[PDB]
């Protein structure tokens, strides 16, 4: 069910604009929630005592 890493070839658009970038500008909006992992790290403050 991944949406990304796949070619999308445009040959018809539901607007009257056929993908023409007026003014040499273009926008791309992307959301995902499948790759949203959160790693946790530590760092010691005193590396001496074994306890």
């Amino acid at each position, epitope marked *: 069910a991944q949406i990304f890493n796949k070619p999308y070839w445009l040959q018809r658009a539901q607007g009257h604009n056929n993908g023409i970038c007026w003014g040499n500008q273009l926008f791309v909006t992307v959301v995902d929630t499948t790759r949203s992992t959160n790693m946790s790290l530590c760092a010691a403050i*005193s590396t001496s005592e074994t306890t």
Partner: antibody
Amino acid sequence: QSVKESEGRLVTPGTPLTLTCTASGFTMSRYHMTWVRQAPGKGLEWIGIIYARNSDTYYANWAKGRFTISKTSTTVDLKITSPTIEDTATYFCARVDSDSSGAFDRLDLWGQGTLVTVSS
Amino acid sequence: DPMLTQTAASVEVAVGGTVTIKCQASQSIGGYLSWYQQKPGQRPKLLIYRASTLASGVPSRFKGSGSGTEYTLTFSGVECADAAAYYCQQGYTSSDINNAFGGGTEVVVK
């Protein structure tokens, strides 16, 4: 909030001795408890510690074999096994206000403290 | 064993002076450190913990700084009821130590 003690006694060396410590508002199974001893001159000496759900204890270096800290859900107390002459001083019971990780030795809300003395 | 010595008897100060009490530690304790005022007739009473965060019901004219192994406690505008005893105290909760977190005094202010 307020921390209460048991009333002091003038005792003889060679007799076991107790002091109970009850709290007013908070429950004691959440926080930690410890004991400090205020001697004349300077003296201000910490005894040990006891934790909440782990229920572990750690004493001072000189204080092993000499104090046993007991705790129920309603009351904490400490015990003395064999008193020596020079422990005529002032004892205090206080709550360790800590956070999710520390259990560091901040004693935020103290007790009023009573006078215990030994004499022969 | 982390040890804070506090071998410093306090100097005579007037109304409005500034006092630098310095508490040094042998081992690194992080920021976990407390301070107390002991009036010589009643129970001890705490001002600041973790060297930066003051307690409730205490004016903001007391200061806190220091990191690592050495720490300080300064304030200014000494009142009449500041004649007490002071104590720095660590929170490294170790087992084989015999801390007592001792040292510290304060003269009667003129």
